[PDB]
Amino acid sequence: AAGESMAQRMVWVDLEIEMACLITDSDLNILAEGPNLIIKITLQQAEYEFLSFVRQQTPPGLCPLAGNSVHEDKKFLDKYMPQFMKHLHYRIIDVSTVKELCRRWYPEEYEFAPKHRALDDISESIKELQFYRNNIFKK
Amino acid sequence: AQRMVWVDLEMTGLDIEKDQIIEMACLITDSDLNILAEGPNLIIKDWCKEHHGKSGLTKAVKESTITLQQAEYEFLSFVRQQTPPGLCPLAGNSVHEDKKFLDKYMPQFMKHLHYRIIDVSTVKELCRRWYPEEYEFAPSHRALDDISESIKELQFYRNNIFKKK
Ligand SMILES: [Mg+2]
Ligand SMILES: [Mg+2]
């Protein structure tokens, strides 16, 4: 159905302050790169740039934050970039959850799984979730 | 030491600055999601008003005799008998929100737990995207009933969308 594919996009973010953001479709293909910024430009200007980017890329309130350190980053952004987070769903896609499931239920596969800039961390998180999909999810 | 600490919360709202915890339940599973021990299940002294009037929880919250300190004592005692310090994750459906409220209001309890979470809703979002057929067949706003459903939902995902050995 029209629009469903867009409603299933993911907003990958990482914070290290250095912040980056990418968009993927539901199959983890990167569709667009967003701002890659250093923050004390001001917090407000940065938020505006990320918010405009996600407004071009995901419909209001429908897409989740994604990454490895994602509930912690969401804790940060809920407070310092609330208008940005308002554009997103409240659920998250926590790759670390899948990592913990892999460790427990697929130890053999976990040994082969992938393990300092924010953009690089996003790249690794996507490759990690992809590894999980390829190797511990039903074919 | 690979056990999971399942927790579900009911609160007066999602505002971390003003709202409080009014119900809380905890279950201990092994890493294959078998329930090993049932922990305390406690009620602590416009959407929320309706949905908590229904289910009788705001009634029970007016009748309760359990303070936040007493609740945290009982939960901390339980997890100290059931899990080794620092090693096990919080698990549940709304677990990052619940962890937000527990970090603020039950800090010793959280300090007994690992920092990693097992978020069933992440798996739900993934199943929705990658296994929509199975997602359609997948699994009372009260803590104990919801955490029990959450375990059953993770189990359904494991049985139906994770690869078979
Ligand atoms: Mg829940
Ligand atoms: Mg609930």
Numbering used by the authors:
A (entry chain A): 34 to 49, 61 to 84, 115 to 189, 194 to 217
B (entry chain B): 40 to 84, 95 to 188, 193 to 218
Task: Quote the authors verbatim.
We obtained three complex cocrystals, referred to as Rexo2–RNA (Rexo2–D199A bound with a 12-nt U12 RNA and Mg2+), Rexo2–DNA1 (wild-type Rexo2 bound with a 5-nt T5 DNA), and Rexo2-DNA2 (Rexo2–D199A bound with a 10-nt T10 DNA and Mg2+). The electron density for DNA oligonucleotides in Rexo2–DNA1 was broken, likely because wild-type Rexo2 was used here for cocrystallization with the partially degraded DNA. In the Rexo2–DNA1 complex, we used wild-type Rexo2 for cocrystallization with DNA in the absence of Mg2+. However, again, we still observed two metal ions (with a low occupancy of 0.81 for MgA and 0.73 for MgB) bound in the active site, likely representing endogenous Mg2+ from the E. coli host strain. In the Rexo2–RNA and Rexo2–DNA1 complexes, only the last two 3′-end nucleotides were observed, i.e., U–U in Rexo2–RNA and T–T in Rexo2–DNA1, with the remainder of the substrates being disordered. Similarly, in Rexo2–DNA1 and Rexo2–DNA2 complex structures, DNA substrates were bound only in the active site of protomer B but not observed in protomer A. Moreover, the 3′-end OH group (O3′) forms a hydrogen bond with the Met50 backbone (NH atom) and Glu49 (Oδ) in all three complexes, providing the structural basis for the preference of Rexo2 for cleaving oligonucleoties with a 3′-OH end. The crystal structures of Rexo2 in complex with DNA reveal a similar DNA oligonucleotide-binding mode to that for RNA.
Human RNA exoribonuclease 2 (Rexo2) is an evolutionarily conserved 3′-to-5′ DEDDh-family exonuclease located primarily in mitochondria. Rexo2 degrades small RNA oligonucleotides of <5 nucleotides (nanoRNA) in a way similar to Escherichia coli Oligoribonuclease (ORN), suggesting that it plays a role in RNA turnover in mitochondria. Rexo2 forms a homodimer and interacts mainly with the last two 3′-end nucleobases of substrates by hydrophobic and π−π stacking interactions via Leu53, Trp96, and Tyr164, signifying its preference in binding and degrading short oligonucleotides without sequence specificity. Rexo2 contains four strictly conserved DEDD residues (D47, E49, D147, D199) for binding two metal ions, as well as a general base (H194) in the active site for hydrolysis of the phosphodiester bonds in nucleic acid substrates.
